[PDB]
């Protein structure tokens, strides 16, 4: 067995941006209300259960380059 | 047995913005609300549950590239 | 066995943009509800249960590149 | 037995874009129901109950190119 | 069994950007409510409940490159 | 009094050549005489008197863009 | 009064030349001769008073990009 | 009064030359001659008299970009 | 009175050049005579009288970029 | 009065040369003569009077960046 594995990244991943310029994010509130009696949770749960979700998220170059190279025998 | 494996990668991911200029993002607030008695989970269980989601995602430059290479024998 | 796995890629991803100018998202306020008793969850579950989505998605520049590689014997 | 796998990928995938302009995503509230007594899921489930999704989505530059290479013996 | 694992990268990550600008934040207050009887974790559980996210998430260069090498035999 | 003024030039001037080959410039010499007897300038004179101007310009890509933006109240 | 001024250049100016070759610039010599008596030169004068200009200008690329904005009140 | 001055400058001005190859400027001998009895300058005079001007401007890119902003109240 | 000035340069000025090559400046000699009684200078004169100039100017690239900026009130 | 002045300047002045080659610059003799009887300088003069100008510049990269930034009131 010969096994050869070469890959060549190259890639340019380019983004300019003179500007981005004025933002806003202005809005209002909000409510939120959950009801139950119990529960039970097993086995890798993930469970985010009320919430209020306000973000602003700006890069300036937010270029997300991923990657996943894998073998196996 | 032989294998080679040259994958040979360039690719340009190029994006220029020159300016954005003004952004407003302003609704108004919302209600939300979620009853019951109870619950059970199990075996990799993902369960958001209420929930008020504003987001600004602004990237002056945002490309995403991605890859996934793999092999098997 | 004799395997040879080069491919070369190139491609180039451009994508200028002068200028995005003003934007505005600006909804009102609505409202969600559920209601029942009880659930149970196995294998692999993924459940968003009651949200308000609000999003601005500006990216100067989001070109998504994607790609999947994939041998097998 | 002999194999050769050269895939020449060139392609440009350009998109200019002198301008945008203004933009107004402006709706109305509106309301959610979802009514029940009981459920349960197994064996990959995925489910959205009740949502308001309000999204701007403004890539200056939004080429998505996309591939899949696969082989198999 | 002779292997040979040599994947050049060379990736270039850049985004410049001349200048931000003005960016706004400010919504209104909001509540939350959570009421049930008792509950039981077990197995790599992960839930909040109850929160209010404030975030203001401004990199001058926020590119995330991310990787993932893998063999197996 | 509300002035705006947003030019978006994006004109590509390209002008490849792949090969500009063998030139000759080989003339024979010539004579020049002035003759007068007094003079006088005044107030932005330009003036060549007497000359013999070879040249040989070769530019491998020569392409002059120009502008002339201009505003006035 | 309110006046924006957001000239948005973009201007590629590309010149490739794979090559340009031999070149020759092989005249022969010629004479030169002004005669007078006298001068005066006043306010601003710019005279060249015989000369022999040999040149060969050769630029690689020699793209002569120019501009000029003026702005007045 | 209001002004704003923002003018977006992004000009590439790009010139390859894989190559220049051989040149010559081989020209002859020439005289030159200026006779007068006397002058008198002033005020911002220039004035080359009596020259032998050989040049070989040879740039590997000699791109001149140039600019003049200018503004005045 | 409220002003802003926000150029935003960012011009790429560039020129590869893989070779130049030979180049020969091989000329012969020339004279020059000038003949007058007497002079006077006065208020910036500027005055080059009998030269012989013998250049060989080669960058290996030479790309003059040049600005001027200037207000006034 | 409120004045504000946030030029950005980015402009790469790129020039890469693989190589230059060979270079000769093998002219010949000449002479220069002038001839008068008095004269007198005034108020910044400045005159070269015979000259003899053989030069051989040659930077490996010889680009001139220029500025002038300039206010007044």
Do not use: A, M
């Not at 990244?9 to 806003?24: A, E, P, R, Y």
């Not at 009696?37 to 749960?45: G, W």
């Amino acid at each position: 067995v010969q096994i050869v594995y070469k890959p060549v990244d190259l890639s340019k991943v380019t983004s300019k941006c003179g500007s981005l310029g004025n933002i806003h994010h202005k809005p209002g509130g909000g409510q939120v209300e959950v009801k139950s009696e119990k529960l039970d949770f097993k086995d890798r749960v993930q469970s985010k259960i009320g919430s209020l979700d306000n973000i602003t998220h700006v890069p300036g170059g937010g270029n997300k380059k991923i990657e996943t190279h894998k073998l196996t025998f």
